[PDB]
Amino acid sequence: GFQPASRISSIGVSEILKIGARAAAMKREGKPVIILGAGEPDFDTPEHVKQAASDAIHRGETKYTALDGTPELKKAIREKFQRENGLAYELDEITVATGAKQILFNAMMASLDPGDEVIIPTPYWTSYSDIVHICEGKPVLIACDASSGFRLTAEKLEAAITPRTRWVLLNSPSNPSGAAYSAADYRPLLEVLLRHPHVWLLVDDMYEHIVYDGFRFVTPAQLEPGLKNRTLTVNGVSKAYAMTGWRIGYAGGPRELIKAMAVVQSQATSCPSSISQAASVVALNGPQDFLKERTESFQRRRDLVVNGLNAIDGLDCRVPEGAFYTFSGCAGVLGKVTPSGKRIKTDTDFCAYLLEDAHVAVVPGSAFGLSPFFRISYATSEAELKEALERIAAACDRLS
Amino acid sequence: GFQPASRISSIGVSEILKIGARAAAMKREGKPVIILGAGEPDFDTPEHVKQAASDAIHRGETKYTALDGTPELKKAIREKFQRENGLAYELDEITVATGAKQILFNAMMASLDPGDEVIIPTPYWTSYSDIVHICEGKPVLIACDASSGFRLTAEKLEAAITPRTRWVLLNSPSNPSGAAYSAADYRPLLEVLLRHPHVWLLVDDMYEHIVYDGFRFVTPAQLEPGLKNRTLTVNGVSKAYAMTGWRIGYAGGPRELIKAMAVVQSQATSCPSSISQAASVVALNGPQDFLKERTESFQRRRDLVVNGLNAIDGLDCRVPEGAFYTFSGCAGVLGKVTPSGKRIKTDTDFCAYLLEDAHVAVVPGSAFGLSPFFRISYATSEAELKEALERIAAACDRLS
Ligand SMILES: *Cc1c(COP(=O)(O)O)cnc(C)c1O
Ligand SMILES: *Cc1c(COP(=O)(O)O)cnc(C)c1O
């Protein structure tokens, strides 16, 4: 009889998976369901990156690499940080792993002891707290509502820090709100952190290259040199280059942390795929102009969803600054009754109604730690979004 | 300053890496050291496997897959276990990870609580005990000397089992010994394990397809159906297909352990590379005849090393059954003096003399937990092996 380790005892089944399972069963019943939960861009890997992978395969780059990345890829990353972020890292301050997921995992495994706290602003994707839990740490969730654009404030950060705080997670743009920090937004938070030298910064910049309206992306180790010696700047090719299947993430940070992360990586995975690494060299080093057209395509779909929802009675949707999610408010539908007699008390109730009665799957704000809201991923076709918006509107109009 | 987590406090630097670094420095100095430490086969990924990868890239198989493997790869693994090992595993009993390294890591992370014991027969590679350490377990090392062919015996396994024993590691063929368990070798251990239902079997079959002399490969869950509900059968494409850089390992085992491993994998890596998975489908489903020529090439090189060492007074080398390592005794050189006046007291001293004065780098048995021996990897060219054996013989002749 199998007995799971205690370290996974606090990891449950995500509400997102439960929703996915219900939608899947409904399809088996013969009920087509639109699921608005895409977690990867609906673009392919760029052709020149595909060709670089094929060339590496042909040349026989099929052997183990250096544990935490080829020198060539580390140099491509160093150049990316300098070119794109005005951020200077040495080669021994750079690490490469199997996705940004493993970057985050390695960093927590390399640092957290039982009871160590990690401050996580919400709304947030629970994947972050599951990583903290398996490393025996304590997630400390800090709710940030629309009044601060879903962003952490200096006052809330200061009040959240305790003797056990080891990290603060700063993820911008984020899943599910799409909120991004400008330099003005970051500065008061970095001032707080300058006064807390034992608190390290876990910076997740994965949506850097999906930002809208001309937003100038910045990152804390760039803005505040006084925090560079305790910041892990996490990034990767998954979202920027539509390379989620390739599993390459990377980071820049202090050499002693990078060294500890390599100890974890040596136990967990050894080196990431040599083929994906070779692909990622050319993703970073090659032409970048194609990113503009993809951003414009995402932004057109952002506007479609935001404007669609703000034409529906009961909903109020802010304009996300980046990533490919909307996090619309739905306070206006609470208290209404469905045609079948059900009272809509929570955003959970509302999303369950949209699923069963409108055959559209969205995720309630309750699952991300802030209500009353719901998340749409618009990394899908304009046609599917238009149909889903029509169904959501019709279902909202049937509430009374 | 950075404080590493307690969970890596027992993981140090491997003596193998220190030896490789010193050998590498000598070569930079113009001393043409032959380093006999290859841990991957010196063949390339088969052409048809390369083509399948390039085809999958071109088709756009660049997205996240199912967390623990595509249905196509799980089906190919299911057929491999049935066709090659007579083992019947369901789809929910199969998992795919970033190398067999991650299979082992996930299994230990999913099961071990602090203080849980894992029995590790020695001679062993400390990579196994490092994994147990980072999962907060206690490696229980059981030395198996040449009198049992470097294999675990029933009496030693029975004596080593305690209430806290969670796993016994059964790795056949072995790095560093090259020894493999026949059915007759396994049977008394399996009889012991039937009497201890709390002990699970961690079966590392990675060198399955590098076995010699017509050896009939067998694996515990096939040999003893009464243990299949608590055996993890670990395997992978790295060694069989020369695909170490692609990072794909897999396992068959009880559904509840497979489920818990997926919880770990979701925090550590998400899915392994979609491209490597597609290559591995064809590695497993494709033609296997090429393995014959590779085995014959490996066996010729094995014979070079065994016969070469046994022509040197003071060395006694057993014939390995599989993998590409010899683990020769060197008791007959202990007590002798080098031309520079150093007395050779340990296999450590002997190997340092071979490095500095014969310009051949091998690893002493002390590094694997059994003396007096030394390990050679013969996954290199016959010419390089013949030259290395000449140098070892000359250096042994100069002893007094
Ligand atoms: C996609 C994503 C990740 C995971 O990246 P992978 O490299 O695919 O593992 C981590 N953080 C954020 C904010 C992401 O969008
Ligand atoms: C090579 C090897 C491993 C590691 O396999 P990867 O898939 O490359 O991580 C594990 N066990 C044994 C016996 C091996 O030979």
The three-state (H, E, C) secondary structure of chain A, written as one string: CCCCCHHHCCCCCCHHHHHHHHHHHHHHCCCCCEECCCCCCCCCCCHHHHHHHHHHHHHCCCCCCCCCCCHHHHHHHHHHHHHHHCCCCCHHHEEEECHHHHHHHHHHHHHCCCCCEEEEEECCCCHHHHHHHHCCCEEEEEECCHHHCCCCCHHHHHHHCCCCEEEEEEECCCCCCCCCCCHHHHHHHHHHHHCCCCCEEEEECCCCCCECCCCCCCCHHHHCHHHHHHEEEEEECCCCCCCHHHCCEEEECCHHHHHHHHHHHHHHCCCCCHHHHHHHHHHHHCCCCHHHHHHHHHHHHHHHHHHHHCCCCCCECCCCCECCEEEEECHHHCCCECCCCCECCCHHHHHHHHHHHHCEECEEHHHHCCCCEEEEECCCCHHHHHHHHHHHHHHHHHCC
DSSP state of B160: H
User: Does the C-beta of A204 come closer than 6 Å to ligand 1?
Assistant: yes
CB-CB neighbours of B97 under 10 Å: 32
- How far apart (Å, rounded) are the C-alpha atoms in residues A41 and A324? 8
Closest approach of B117 to chain A, Cα-based (Å): 13
Residue type, A159: A
Q: Which CA distances in Å does B250 have to A269, A273, A282, B108, B325?
A: 13, 15, 30, 15, 23
DSSP strand pairing (B200-204 vs A231-236): unpaired
**Burial of residue B383 (number of CB atoms within 10 Å: 0-12, 13-18, 19+):** exposed
Instruction: Tell which of B57, B95, B165 to mutate to test the A interface (max A CBs under 10 Å).
Output: B57
Sequence-distant (6+) residues with CB within 8 A of B155 are: none
Instruction: Tell which of B42, B43, B63, B200 to mutate to test the A interface (max A CBs under 10 Å).
Output: B63
| B345 phi/psi in degrees, rounded to 5 | -95, -25
A243 alpha carbon, closest ligand? 1
Contact B269 A134 (CB under 8 A): no
With beta carbons under 8 A apart, name residues in chain A contacting B53: 57, 275
Distance of CA B219 to the CA centre of its chain: 15
Contact B64 A244 (CB under 8 A): yes
Q: How many CB pairs under 8 A join A and B?
A: 200
Which residues sit opposite A94 in a β-bridge? A252
Q: Enumerate long-range contacts of B41-44, CB under 8 Å, 24 or more apart.
A: B41/B210, B41/B239, B41/B242, B41/B294, B41/B298, B41/B324, B41/B379, B42/B379, B42/B380, B42/B381, B43/B242, B43/B294, B44/A60, B44/A62, B44/B242
Resolution value in angstroms:
1.9
Which H or E run contains B142? Answer: strand B138-143
Contact B275 A271 (CB under 8 A): no
Domain ranges in chain A? 1-62+287-395, 63-286
CB-CB neighbours of A28 under 10 Å: 7
Residue type, A329: G
Binding residues of A for L-aspartate: 37, 125, 175, 375
- How far apart (Å, rounded) are the C-alpha atoms in residues A102 and A109? 10
For B260, half-sphere exposure in the C-beta direction (CA atoms, 13 angstrom radius) is: 25
- How far apart (Å, rounded) are the C-alpha atoms in residues B260 and B265? 9
Q: Which CA distances in Å does B302 have to A373, B59, B306, B314, B318?
A: 66, 42, 6, 19, 11
Binding residues of A: 37, 125, 175, 375
Contact B5 A112 (CB under 8 A): yes
User: What is the DSSP secondary-structure string of B274-325?
Assistant: HHHHHHHHHHHHS--THHHHHHHHHHHHHHHHHHHHTTSTT-B----SBTTE
Q: Taking a C-beta distance cutoff of 8 angstroms, is the pair B226, B29 a contact?
A: no
Q: Taking a C-beta distance cutoff of 8 angstroms, is the pair A306, A319 a contact?
A: yes
Helix/strand/coil for B140: strand
CB-nearest to A5 from B109, B131, B134 is: B109
Helix/strand/coil for B117: strand
- How far apart (Å, rounded) are the C-alpha atoms in residues B93 and B91? 5
| CATH superfamily name and code, B1-62+287-395 | Aspartate Aminotransferase, domain 1 (3.90.1150.10)
Structure solved using which method? X-ray
Contact A64 B39 (CB under 8 A): yes
Cα dihedral value A244, A212, A42, A235, nearest 10: 0
The closest alpha carbon to B280, from B97, B104, B83, B105, belongs to B97
User: Does the C-beta of A350 come closer than 6 Å to ligand 1?
Assistant: no
What is the total residue count of chain B? Answer: 400
With beta carbons under 8 A apart, name residues in chain A contacting B131: 267
- How far apart (Å, rounded) are the C-alpha atoms in residues A9 and A4? 8
Closest approach of A310 to chain B, Cα-based (Å): 32
| Greatest CA separation for chain A | 66
Residue type, A365: G
Contact B8 A98 (CB under 8 A): no
Which H or E run contains B232? Answer: strand B231-236
Sequence-distant (6+) residues with CB within 8 A of A17 are: none
Q: Taking a C-beta distance cutoff of 8 angstroms, is the pair A359, A33 a contact?
A: yes
Which residues sit opposite A234 in a β-bridge? A204, A251
Q: Taking a C-beta distance cutoff of 8 angstroms, is the pair A251, A92 a contact?
A: no
Place of tokens 């009675």: A313
- How far apart (Å, rounded) are the C-alpha atoms in residues A209 and A217? 8
CA of A236 to the centre of ligand 1 (A): 8
Whole-angstrom distance between the N-terminal and C-terminal Cα of chain A?
Answer: 52
User: Does the C-beta of B276 come closer than 6 Å to ligand 2?
Assistant: no
- How far apart (Å, rounded) are the C-alpha atoms in residues B232 and B206? 13
Which residues sit opposite B48 in a β-bridge? none
- Here the tokens at position B317 are 């080398």
Q: Which CA distances in Å does B339 have to B8, B32, B314, B333, B342?
A: 42, 20, 17, 14, 8
The closest alpha carbon to A235, from A207, A265, A270, belongs to A207
Closest residue by CA, ligand 1 atom 2: A206
DSSP state of B346: S
Check whether B166 is labelled as a binding-site residue. Answer: no
Q: Taking a C-beta distance cutoff of 8 angstroms, is the pair B224, B233 a contact?
A: no
- How far apart (Å, rounded) are the C-alpha atoms in residues B125 and B130? 9
| B363 phi/psi in degrees, rounded to 5 | -115, 130
- How far apart (Å, rounded) are the C-alpha atoms in residues A122 and A369? 6
Contact A5 B39 (CB under 8 A): no
- How far apart (Å, rounded) are the C-alpha atoms in residues A169 and B211? 50
CB-CB neighbours of A393 under 10 Å: 17
CB-CB neighbours of A300 under 10 Å: 11
- How far apart (Å, rounded) are the C-alpha atoms in residues A200 and A203? 10
DSSP strand pairing (B363-364 vs B373-377): antiparallel
CATH fold group of domain B63-286:
Aspartate Aminotransferase; domain 2 (3.40.640)
Give break positions in chain A: residue before each, C–N beyond 2.5 Å.
Answer: none
Closest residue by CA, ligand 1 atom 14: A206
- How far apart (Å, rounded) are the C-alpha atoms in residues A176 and A326? 7
With beta carbons under 8 A apart, name residues in chain A contacting B113: 5-7
- Here the tokens at position B212 are 């010699």
CB-CB neighbours of A139 under 10 Å: 19
CB-CB neighbours of A341 under 10 Å: 6
DSSP strand pairing (B34-35 vs B360-361): parallel
CB crowding B67-93: b at 16 or more within 10 Å, else e: ebbbebbbbbbbebbeebbebebeeeb
Check whether B37 is labelled as a binding-site residue. Answer: yes
| B333 phi/psi in degrees, rounded to 5 | -100, -10
Which residues sit opposite A204 in a β-bridge? A171, A234
CB crowding A259-290: b at 16 or more within 10 Å, else e: bbbbbbbbbbbbbbbbbbbbbbbbbbbeebee
Q: Taking a C-beta distance cutoff of 8 angstroms, is the pair A20, A34 a contact?
A: no
Q: Taking a C-beta distance cutoff of 8 angstroms, is the pair B379, B325 a contact?
A: no
CB-nearest to B269 from A39, A60, A269 is: A269
- How far apart (Å, rounded) are the C-alpha atoms in residues B188 and B192? 6
- How far apart (Å, rounded) are the C-alpha atoms in residues B270 and B257? 17
CA of B213 to the centre of ligand 2 (A): 23
Give break positions in chain B: residue before each, C–N beyond 2.5 Å.
Answer: none
Sequence-distant (6+) residues with CB within 8 A of A245 are: B61, B62, B63, B64, B65, B271, B273, B274, B275
